[PDB]
Design a protein around this ligand. Structure first.
Ligand SMILES: Cn1ccnc1-c1cccc(Oc2[nH+]c(Oc3cc(C(=N)N)ccc3O)c(F)c(N3CCC[C@@H](C(=O)O)C3)c2F)c1
Ligand SMILES: [Ca+2]
Length: 223
């Protein structure tokens, strides 16, 4: 997150860190046994870390759980990033509490202008690399389809939405990928891609979760 603020320990209880001996992607806890992330974050040997604040220190409240299976959307296209969504099943259920909680799936898509909270342990710099220890937060609005398309001609599908600031300096970035975009208590987006980070006229692009509710439910039910 570029241009954000320190969230405060366990203030974003559904935030998960995907770990393979280092933090590589975010995710969201949607029930005691399932996490949603981005398909582009897929890899084998994933350990899900719940209840994290400082990802480099064991502070208490953490729960480390291996992934039993990772389900990449069957129509994910690595060239276009269309359908950039993945489901991860935990080997054992998370213990839900004050600090580790699920986030609800949307019932309807969010409109342009809706303010959302984006969070992660990704890069905090536009120019250069600087990874934080603690979780960073950013409040950002969903942009109109028209602005989004103007920014990334021919690259925006019906399964994507733009959120952020055209003036630059505030955005998600590498390392935040697969993490949550929460609007009015519902998971509306997944951090997917953008051209650089916090660059003028190049807002972040997010997987539009409301288009996958049925798919999520159906997939979980059969696994
Ligand atoms: C439209 N489309 C189809 C297939 N790929 C794409 C694109 C196009 C443009 C950017 C895309 O995503 C990308 N997003 C990034 O950064 C991100 C930016 C944002 C944001 N601004 N809100 C969110 C998540 C990100 O992962 C990259 F750093 C990146 N890299 C550039 C190449 C080197 C790579 C690294 O590992 O060293 C970093 C990249 F290709 C993905
Ligand atoms: Ca920790």
């Amino acid at each position: 997150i570029v241009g954000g603020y320190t969230c405060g320990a366990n203030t974003v209880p559904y935030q998960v860190s995907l770990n393979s001996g280092y933090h590589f992607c975010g995710g969201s806890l949607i029930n005691s046994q399932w996490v949603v992330s981005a398909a582009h974050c897929y890899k084998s040997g994933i350990q899900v870390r719940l209840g994290e604040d400082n990802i480099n220190v064991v502070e208490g409240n953490e729960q480390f759980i291996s992934a039993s299976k990772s389900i990449v959307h069957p129509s994910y296209n690595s060239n276009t990033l269309n359908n950039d969504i993945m489901l991860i099943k935990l080997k054992s259920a998370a213990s839900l509490n004050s600090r580790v909680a699920s986030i609800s799936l949307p019932t309807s898509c969010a409109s342009a202008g809706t303010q959302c909270l984006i969070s992660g342990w990704g890069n905090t710099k536009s120019s250069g690399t600087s990874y934080p220890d603690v979780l960073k937060c950013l409040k950002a609005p969903i942009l109109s389809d028209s602005s989004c398309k103007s920014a990334y001609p021919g690259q925006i599908t019906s399964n994507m939405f733009c959120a952020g600031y055209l003036e630059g300096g505030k955005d998600s970035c590498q390392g935040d990928s697969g993490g949550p975009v929460v609007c009015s208590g519902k998971l509306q987006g997944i951090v997917s891609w953008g051209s650089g980070c916090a660059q003028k006229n190049k807002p972040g692009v997010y997987t539009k979760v409301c288009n996958y509710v049925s798919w999520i439910k159906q997939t979980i039910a059969s696994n």
